[PDB]
Structure 1
Amino acid sequence: SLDFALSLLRRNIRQVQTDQGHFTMLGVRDRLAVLPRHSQPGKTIWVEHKLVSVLDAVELVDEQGVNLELTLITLDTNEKFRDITKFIPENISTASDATLVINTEHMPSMFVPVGDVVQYGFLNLSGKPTHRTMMYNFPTKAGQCGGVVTSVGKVVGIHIGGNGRQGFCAGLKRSYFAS
């Protein structure tokens, strides 16, 4: 079923470009959105070919101070994202038979069946650590970062990396988005 993923594409998931290239952005509520940290959003970001000022950005770490590979940004806009925090679990959550939802200029409105999303934890890519990751046995590619991992009406992760055969996401929990 594509219905839940589609509802997020319509109201929450946007094509963006930063100085690092093309990414999928997840708007969570109000003016608050999340990107993979390595997208390095600057003082402005291109959202579907519109220049948008970024008011604040925080590169999240866990309590040990280790990178989570997620950056929260506040956009300078009067638009509000429909609040999806209720779909984000309170704890980092594995999932079965997930759909990775990608939306960039190169990969528009894309629904990728990635299979089960399984615990991984501490992951090192390019020599850089990330905590709270999960893995799927699907050959994800460049350009898919920021993709939204969904399963059974839950939003559980953001795509961050891959080795050519498997893919990895940063897990989401609801408290990351609390005010």
Structure 2
Amino acid sequence: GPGFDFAQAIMKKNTVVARTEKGEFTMLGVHDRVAVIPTHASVGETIYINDVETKVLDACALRDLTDTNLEITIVKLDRNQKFRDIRHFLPRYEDDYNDAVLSVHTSKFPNMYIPVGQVTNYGFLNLGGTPTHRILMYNFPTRAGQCGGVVTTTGKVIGIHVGGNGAQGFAAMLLHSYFTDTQKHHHH
């Protein structure tokens, strides 16, 4: 059955509530002071983290080599606590998965777990009228309030929730190589 225990360990040590001008989003902390949030949250130069105003030291809105939205934004945050390093739980490659859990951590739902079943590497989605790539799909009627929600199977953190149509839900993939310590590069 679904890996509830794994989902809970991730939620407990690696999520915070983030709030931007667009509202609240579950936020996954990946390592150090680096976390993720859906690009459509519109992160600015400060953000609320568990209701504490926090400087956004860096925000990278990921796009692929076709210059298409991946709907993941990586943020670096000015705060004292380091996130437990969970990069070894990120998949190396695109993939399909079984029996996934979607976990939410907001003010309305400080801790909630939803078995969404099979998750398929879906690819392209015209999300909200923005072309988007590398989407995961699950047949579950996901709702507003669930964006940023963490999609896991046992031992893997596979994506964050970004969208739905009333019958399916959509997550943006997380891949290991998004977070490897890397390259000297002017990015803004």
Q: Same fold (TM over 0.5)?
A: yes
Q: Distance in 2 between matches of 1:147 and 1:93?
A: 19
Give aligned-pair identity as a percent: 53
Q: Please, which runs of 5 or more residues in structure 1 have no aligned partner? A: none
Could you tell me how far apart the structure 2 residues matched to 1:93 and 1:13 are?
24
Per-residue CA distance 1:129-178 (angstroms, 9 max, x = gap): 11000100000000100001000210011100000110001011100111
Stretches of structure 2 that go unaligned for 5 or more consecutive residues are 182-188
Aligned to 2:129: 127
* 2:64 matched residue in structure 1: 62
Alignment match, 2:174: 172
Q: Give the secondary-structure state (helix, strand or coil) at the position aligned to 2:18.
A: strand
Deviation at 1:62, TM superposition (A): 0.9
Q: Which amino acid aligns with 1:95?
A: Y
How much does 1:64 deviate?
1.3
Correspondence 1:6-85 to 2 at 5 A: 6-85=8-87
Partner of 1:140: 142
Contact 1:101 1:148 in 2 (8 A): yes
SS of the residue corresponding to residue 16 of structure 1 reads: strand
Match of 1:151 among 150, 153, 159: 153
Provide the TM-score with structure 2 as the length reference: 0.93
In structure 2, what residue type is equivalent to 1:100? L
Shift of 1:43: 0.9
Q: Superposition RMSD on alpha carbons, in Å?
A: 0.9
CA distance in 2, matches of 1:45, 1:164: 29
Return the offset for 1:42. 1.2
Q: Contact between 1:92 and 1:156, CA under 8 Å: does it hold in 2?
A: no
Q: Name the SS for the 2:131 alignment partner.
A: strand
Rounded to whole Å, the distance in 1 between the matches of 2:24 and 2:78 is 20
How many residues end up aligned between the 2 structures?
179
TM-score by length of 1: 0.97
Name the CA distance, whole Å, in 2 between partners of 1:119 and 1:23.
23
User: In 2, are the aligned partners of 1:93 and 1:156 still within 8 Å (CA)?
Assistant: no
Q: SS of the counterpart of 2:141? A: coil
Runs of 4+ in 1 over 4 A off after TM superposition: none
Q: Distance in 2 between matches of 1:36 and 1:126?
A: 13
